[PDB]
Amino acid sequence: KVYQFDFGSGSMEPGYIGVRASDRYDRSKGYGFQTPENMRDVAASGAGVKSDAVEFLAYGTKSNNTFNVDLPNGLYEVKVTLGNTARASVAAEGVFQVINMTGDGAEDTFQIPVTDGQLNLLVTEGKAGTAFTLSALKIKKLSDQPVTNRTIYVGGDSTVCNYYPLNSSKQAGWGQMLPHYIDKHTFQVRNMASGGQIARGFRNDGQLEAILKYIKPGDYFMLQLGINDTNPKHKESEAEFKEVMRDMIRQVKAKGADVILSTPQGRATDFTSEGIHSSVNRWYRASILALAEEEKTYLIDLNVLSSAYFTSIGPERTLGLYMDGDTLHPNRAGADALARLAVQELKRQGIAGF
């Protein structure tokens, strides 16, 4: 049970159903665009199905400008292949599914339950002003039960989010490396974090809604914010931060799922004269600790655990775990060590599933 669509009008590759921007949704065919007037055929820089694409001229998670495909109810695996891309997200069923994919022909995969017998997807606002294009889709049915598998939903900022290509990016958020440390046969990992995000934004602009749409008992909401929240331009006091964070935790707990809060690690240069790495007062850490106790959530003090690791390897090596000339953003290696520490901590606490 696999449906394959090659979007665009330049070339149609074998094994794929060619879908052009003017192909209006036709129920007798089972697929097509709901509002073709806002779709456009465009060239793409890659090979095969990546040589062409369709561009969504109208977007937004609630936009009717979607590509629809009728499908028997159940759980589906959706592999997305974009066209020429600066930075874009994928939306389906009215909410975000993949956050900020980058690069022409960017690809990623996600699972989604189909309950009304039809999938409605679009590529949407990641970076405003850039082209939101789609080159291909591979839709495969995983189960007749339209229910999601156990999943770890990750919330966060630039030090947590996904960078593309997923397995080749020079930079990475530890949420992107999480899958390399937990059992895939136990958990699915959906890293919904985004660069430069704060608590207020994660809550109000779509990311939380996307997670509340599917999170349920058995799942985990792994949240790490506080870095960007301290920037004055957002005018988000520690008090507001704490309030917003509290609300998100309650909303997620209201779904029966569990919450794991994480204190964000510090800067690569937070070393004292004695060579000890300390960042105990950064990124509103104080409020995160309090919230864990007050709202009874699980807690990974990655701030301290990571500092202990940096202290044990020295300033020079620690510097090699962050982007060059960048003391805030971890590179792939740093992201991998942070993820390692995070899971090692979850196991030490004996948290179910780890």
Ligand SMILES: [Mn+2]
């Ligand atoms: Mn094509």
